[PDB]
Curated annotation (Swiss-Prot):
Reaction catalyzed: Hydrolysis of keratin, and of other proteins with subtilisin-like specificity. Hydrolyzes peptide amides
Entry annotated with the keyword Protease: yes
Transmembrane parts of this sequence: none
Domain spans labelled Peptidase S8: 7-279
Cofactor binding, per record: Binds 2 calcium ions per subunit.
Lineage: Eukaryota, Fungi, Dikarya, Ascomycota, Pezizomycotina
Organism of origin: Parengyodontium album (Tritirachium album)
Entry's Gene Ontology BP terms: proteolysis
Function description: Hydrolyzes keratin at aromatic and hydrophobic residues.
Catalytic site: D39, H69, S224
Cellular component GO terms held in the UniProt record: extracellular region
Protein name (Swiss-Prot/TrEMBL): Proteinase K
Recorded GO MF terms: metal ion binding; serine-type endopeptidase activity
């Protein structure tokens, strides 16, 4: 399938080269998979989600996304126009308040929630969790992400926007999850992207158009935007039977575009997420 005039990041994920604008993908489109977006919530009524998004948990007085961040990330995972996996099921877990903040104890609870809650959902092709959030190093936050991964969920986490080594941030520094840095449309490391040995992969993160609250759209930048590209790619590949939740991060690294990014620090992987789809 071909989506013309796609957001640059979608086109990048299905291309061996930067500078194109058509997204190519297998029409299965993540059908039968599930992606949990652990964030500020999801505006599930947005027409771009087509009824495929729902809130399953909040730790606040509302499940509504009063910020936009979670809706934007969910849109990159699976919205019809802005999403990588356009037929996946999206589940919202609101661990961040409408200012985009959350206590680590709530984030931990949300991760353990997903590990159990997937057993209440129909996801025959596999389960993914996208965590566009983080803070300073916490062994308890890392352990929560490790448990979620161990339980059979492909966990993708943002590397962070500190232009620093991700080893000092959580859950970015947990080795067993998929830690995602950000690149721009010219295949440069995003200026804000964290780096380091713990990164597994890069995805498009600078100037990413996606859904926003109020039934709108906007373009924003961050490793928060790169992470749902990888989460959606994992769901897409699992639906295709190419990989599993346990191995999807490694498979994405194995099949990535290699050596194409600039300003990658010595010791950081030079790997850009790629669906290797041959139309």
């Amino acid at each position: 399938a071909a989506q013309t005039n796609a957001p640059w990041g979608l086109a990048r994920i299905s291309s061996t080269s930067p500078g194109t604008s058509t997204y190519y993908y297998d029409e299965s489109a993540g059908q039968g998979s599930c992606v949990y977006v652990i964030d500020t919530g999801i505006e599930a009524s947005h027409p771009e989600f087509e009824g495929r998004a729902q809130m399953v948990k909040t730790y606040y007085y509302s499940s509504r996304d009063g910020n936009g961040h979670g809706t934007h990330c969910a849109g990159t995972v699976g919205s019809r126009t802005y999403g990588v996996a356009k037929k996946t099921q999206l589940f919202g877990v609101k661990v961040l308040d409408d200012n985009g903040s959350g206590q680590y104890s709530t984030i931990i609870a949300g991760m353990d929630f997903v590990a159990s809650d997937k057993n209440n959902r129909n996801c025959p092709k596999g389960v993914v969790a996208s965590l566009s959030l983080g803070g300073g190093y916490s062994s308890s936050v890392n352990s929560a992400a490790a448990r979620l991964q161990s339980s059979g969920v492909m966990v993708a986490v943002a590397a962070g926007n500190n232009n620093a080594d991700a080893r000092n941030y959580s859950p970015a520094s947990e080795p067993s999850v998929c830690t995602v840095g950000a690149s721009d449309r010219y295949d440069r490391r995003s200026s804000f992207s964290n780096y380091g040995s713990v990164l597994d992969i890069f995805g498009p993160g600078t100037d990413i158009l996606s859904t926003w609250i109020g039934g709108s759209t906007r373009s924003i930048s961050g490793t928060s935007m790169a992470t749902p590209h990888v989460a959606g790619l994992a769901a897409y590949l699992m639906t295709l039977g190419k990989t599993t939740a346990a191995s999807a991060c490694r498979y994405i690294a194995d099949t990535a575009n290699k050596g194409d990014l600039s300003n990658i620090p010595f010791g950081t992987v030079n790997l850009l997420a790629y669906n290797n789809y041959q139309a």
